[PDB]
Design an enzyme around this catalytic site. Structure first.
Site, PDB file in Angstrom:
ATOM      1  CG  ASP A  72      -2.358   0.631   0.738  1.00 38.18           C
ATOM      2  OD1 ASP A  72      -2.684   0.672  -0.467  1.00 38.18           O
ATOM      3  OD2 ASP A  72      -3.093   1.074   1.636  1.00 38.18           O
ATOM      4  NE  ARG A  74      -8.381   0.428  -9.452  1.00 40.41           N
ATOM      5  CZ  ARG A  74      -7.953  -0.340  -8.445  1.00 40.41           C
ATOM      6  NH1 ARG A  74      -7.344   0.200  -7.388  1.00 40.41           N
ATOM      7  NH2 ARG A  74      -8.156  -1.656  -8.484  1.00 40.41           N
ATOM      8  CD  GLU A 108      -1.801   0.401  -4.043  1.00 39.93           C
ATOM      9  OE1 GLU A 108      -2.701   1.264  -4.041  1.00 39.93           O
ATOM     10  OE2 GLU A 108      -2.008  -0.746  -4.472  1.00 39.93           O
TER      11      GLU A 108
HETATM   12 CA   LIG Z   1      -3.876   2.014  -1.856  1.00 36.87          CA
END
Ligand SMILES: [Ca+2]
Length: 352
Positions: free
Chosen positions: A129, A218, A166
């Site tokens: 992350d 996204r 990420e």
């Molecule tokens: Ca993330």
């Protein structure tokens, strides 16, 4: 003072009693925020003791250039990031011109935070992350005039074949009001979500005056809630753009789309399609798809593309005040207002 041109209404740390601090490194930022939690007696205050305006002057270009040269070596390294956890007194992190960072800003259970003029790129830790900017359970956040970048590429053998890097701006949880504006986002495979799962639905987010170039998907991956996207310049979208899911609603206005695949769609769930209201973009009808190189693909599960380029639903009255320039002016002028070193300049019709 609190007007961001979107749902977020905050001045961050630029309030009464604000304490200005200079951070020359990532660690300085951590230390400054930690000290800002203590009162005159040295005891901690829930939410922070006083407002802060941190001017980051550090430069990590060497880490950035080394990473650019060895893209695939990043995902397995430790992630690097400054966590702004439970700080509600108001905080603004502003990079000085020429500053740069190879670490991200992770906001959590905070509110009234502004991060501006930060150049963040090629972060390590995509498999753990390593987000550039993360907004989690944090309302009234303004992410403005930053440059977020990496390489729009996926290396082989990465966990889930999706962790080379990420995201640029991930928003999740109760981050009820957020504004993402004047950001120059480029070379990013996963720009950012708006809801971490099918159940993490909601929020009211505004994306305005952002310049996207060479990004895969996204923009955002929306899960329910409301999304207002106006005056953004979308070019070279290699996968999909705005993915409106879980019955989310989107108002897509006065944006410029070019060389994009699936710019506005609702896919990957197979149901509960979101809706969009289209108005004032450079594309006005299907005939323009050829003109601006807009391509559409199908998906293995039921999906809805905006290939008819018509509104598929409605959108509630936009609360805040804003004044969009024309899609043409965005295309002509936006690259000079978006990003770092623009002195936080904003595009008005006067400049068109
Ligand atoms: Ca993330």
């Amino acid at each position: 003072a609190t007007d961001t041109g979107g749902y977020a209404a905050t001045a961050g740390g630029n309030v009464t009693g604000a304490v200005s601090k200079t951070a020359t490194s990532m660690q300085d930022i951590v230390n400054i925020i930690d000290a800002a939690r203590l009162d005159a007696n040295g005891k901690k205050v829930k939410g922070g003791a006083y407002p802060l305006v941190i001017t980051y002057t550090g430069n990590e270009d060497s880490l950035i250039n080394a990473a650019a040269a060895n893209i695939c070596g990043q995902w397995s390294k430790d992630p690097r990031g400054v966590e702004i956890k439970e700080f509600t007194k108001g905080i603004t992190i502003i990079g000085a011109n020429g500053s740069s960072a190879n670490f991200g800003i992770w906001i959590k259970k905070s509110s009234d935070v502004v991060v501006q003029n930060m150049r963040i790129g090629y972060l390590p830790g995509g498999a753990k992350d390593g987000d550039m900017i993360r907004v989690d359970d944090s309302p009234n956040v303004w992410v403005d005039h930053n440059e977020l970048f990496a390489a729009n590429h996926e290396c082989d053998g990465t966990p889930d074949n999706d962790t080379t890097f990420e995201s640029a701006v991930d928003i999740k949880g109760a981050s009820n009001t957020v504004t993402v504006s004047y950001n120059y986002i480029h070379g990013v495979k996963k720009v950012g979500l708006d809801g971490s799962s099918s159940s993490d639905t909601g929020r009211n987010i505004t994306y305005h005056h952002n310049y996207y170039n060479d990004v895969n998907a996204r923009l955002p991956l929306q899960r329910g809630g409301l999304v207002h996207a106006y005056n953004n310049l979308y070019t070279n979208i290699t996968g999909s753009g705005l993915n409106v899911r879980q019955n989310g609603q989107a108002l897509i206005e006065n944006n410029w789309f070019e060389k994009a695949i699936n710019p506005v769609t609702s896919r990957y769930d197979g149901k509960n399609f979101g809706t969009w209201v289209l108005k004032g973009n450079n594309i006005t009808k299907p005939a323009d798809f050829s003109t601006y190189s807009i391509t559409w693909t199908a998906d293995t599960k039921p999906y809805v593309n905006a290939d008819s380029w018509t509104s598929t639903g409605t959108f509630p009255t936009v609360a805040y005040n804003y004044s969009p320039v024309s899609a043409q002016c965005v295309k002509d002028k936006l690259p000079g207002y978006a990003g770092v070193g623009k002195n936080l300049a904003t595009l008005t019709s006067t400049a068109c």
